[PDB]
Amino acid sequence: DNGLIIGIDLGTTNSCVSVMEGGRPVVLENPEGKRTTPSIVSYKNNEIIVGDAAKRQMVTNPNTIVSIKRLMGTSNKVKVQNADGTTKELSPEQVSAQILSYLKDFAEKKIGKKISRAVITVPAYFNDAERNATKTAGKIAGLNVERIINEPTAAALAYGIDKASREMKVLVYDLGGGTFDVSLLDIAEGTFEVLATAGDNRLGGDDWDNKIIEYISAYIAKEHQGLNLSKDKMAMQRLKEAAERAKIELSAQLETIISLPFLTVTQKGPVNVELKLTRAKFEELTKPLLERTRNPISDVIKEAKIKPEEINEILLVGGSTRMPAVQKLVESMVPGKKPNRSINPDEVVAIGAAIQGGVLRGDLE
Ligand SMILES: Nc1ncnc2c1ncn2[C@@H]1O[C@H](COP(=O)(O)OP(=O)(O)NP(=O)(O)O)[C@@H](O)[C@H]1O
Ligand SMILES: [Mg+2]
Incomplete structure (x- = not known):
């Protein structure tokens, strides 16, 4: 027991x-x-x-x-x-x-x-x-x-923020696969109080994947029309796997190669994909997703009636916070502070x- x-x-x-x-x-x-x-x-x-x-x-x-x-x-x-x-x-x-x-x-x-x-x-x-x-x-x-x-x-x-010696206001930016949460916590006397939350429970790393899928689908469309690509579940499973893999590689490298031989077939033979995707192009394609994470930061600041300088620490949570652009966005919204991503x-x-x-x-x- x-x-x-x-x-x-x-x-x-x-x-x-x-x-x-x-x-x-x-x-x-x-x-x-x-x-x-x-x-x-x-x-x-x-x-x-x-x-x-x-x-x-x-x-x-x-x-x-x-x-x-x-x-x-x-x-x-x-x-x-x-x-x-x-x-x-x-x-x-x-x-x-x-x-x-x-x-x-x-x-x-x-x-x-x-x-x-x-x-x-x-x-x-x-x-x-x-x-x-x-x-x-x-x-x-x-x-x-x-x-x-x-x-x-x-x-x-x-x-270990509960062990802090002084009262702390902590911004948590949590971008997972499916959801995006911003929280402002007050930690005092080893107790936590949620001062404000914001975000979008329909925004997450899947959306960044889906933009690469959209992009590949548009590439295919330049050379092939009427494929009905969605109805090919096997092709769709492969595209999801390739997209997530390409995205992840772009957190560490400046380019990634998407290779999908024999993705599907048309009356003229196989449809293939060989595409080089740079970090810069990935970031341009996903800019609206990234930017949608900005206002929730300001929302929690507003609701808690604090100034930005009152945020003592920032925690990056969620696999998607490995993306360089996400890190940069968070830095831009809390000037002077280095976010925490060491764990x-x-x-x-x-x-x-x-x-x-x-x-x-x-x-x-
Ligand atoms: N190195 C990386 N670069 C970019 N994205 C990454 C990386 N590692 C993991 N991800 C993404 O992180 C997301 C999963 O985040 P994770 O925090 O594990 O989700 P979760 O805890 O289930 N949260 P949630 O989906 O919001 O309920 C997926 O979209 C992954 O592709
Ligand atoms: Mg999570």
């Missing part, structure tokens, strides 16, 4: 699990060797597949469920089809529980012990029904959910959850 409390970031796009070990948070690798796991679940009767293997069929398999977080707290159901043609209705709690179960299972094997306790994170804007859905998901997965904490709070814990931005929320778990378990060594 007083064992380890793991920390879980249950994201729209990806999930991550961490635990305290020897007085430091450790991020646990899944069985594919990855430190994050896609929040994606595929159903084949009783055989349920989670994570990377499910992401590889997200476009091609009608019984693969993505983006379930968006339904948490509602009584909407998702449907999957059994082998015998009957339909199975699933709650968001049930599908989320499969992601939580997968994390729990591989965590147990890595740690070498059974695990029955967790802290799970949620967006700051989640209401009681949304939080309760998340707790229920944990319960279905065999986890006593010791606390639900907010994602920006978790990130601040990871950076891997797609692990920082889970790390904070794990620190919260250690605190709840007690025992100072």
Whole structure:
């Protein structure tokens, strides 16, 4: 009853699990060797597949469920089809529980012990029904959910901001795969207060991917008309994979090559893609997405009735904050301050959850 409390970031796009070990948070690798796991679940009767293997069929398999977080707290159901043609209705709690179960299972094997306790994170804007859905998901997965904490709070814990000696105002800019959250926190006496939030729950790294897809589709259109490219699910799965890969490479390099031999066929033979995409062109194509992240910063400043100079620290959270242009935009909006991105931005929320778990378990060594 007083064992380890793991920390879980249950994201729209990806999930991550961490635990305290020897007085430091450790991020646990899944069985594919990855430190994050896609929040994606595929159903084949009783055989349920989670994570990377499910992401590889997200476009091609009608019984693969993505983006379930968006339904948490509602009584909407998702449907999957059994082998015998009957339909199975699933709650968001049930599908989320499969992601939580997968994390729990591989965590147990890595740690070498059974695990029955967790802290799970949620967006700051989640209401009681949304939080309760998340707790229920944990319960279905065999986890006593010791606390639900907010994602920006978790990130601040990871950076140790609660240990600050003076009162701190902290801006959290969190750009994930599906959603964009800006939060202004006040941390005083080791307690967190959310002063203001803003953002767009329909804006995230997927949109940047989708712009590259749009671009490739327009390239194809210069040489081919009437292809009906969307109806080719195989082609669409490949385009999504290629787009995300190209985007990621452009966070580190100034150019990337998109190569898609035999993408689809026309009456004159195969359609191929060989395109060099520079960072500058990628940034021009995605400028409207980037710019949409600016006003939410100013929104939180306005609502909290602060001046920009009152922001003591900025935290970059979410995988998309690896993009150079995003970093630059944030710098431009809080002049003088160097944002924090030293803790891997797609692990920082889970790390904070794990620190919260250690605190709840007690025992100072
Ligand atoms: N190096 C990189 N450069 C650019 N984008 C990246 C990089 N690494 C990861 N991403 C993107 O980060 C996004 C996933 O962010 P992540 O923070 O893991 O999502 P999440 O926690 O599920 N949050 P959310 O989707 O908003 O509910 C995807 O769009 C990835 O392609
Ligand atoms: Mg996130």
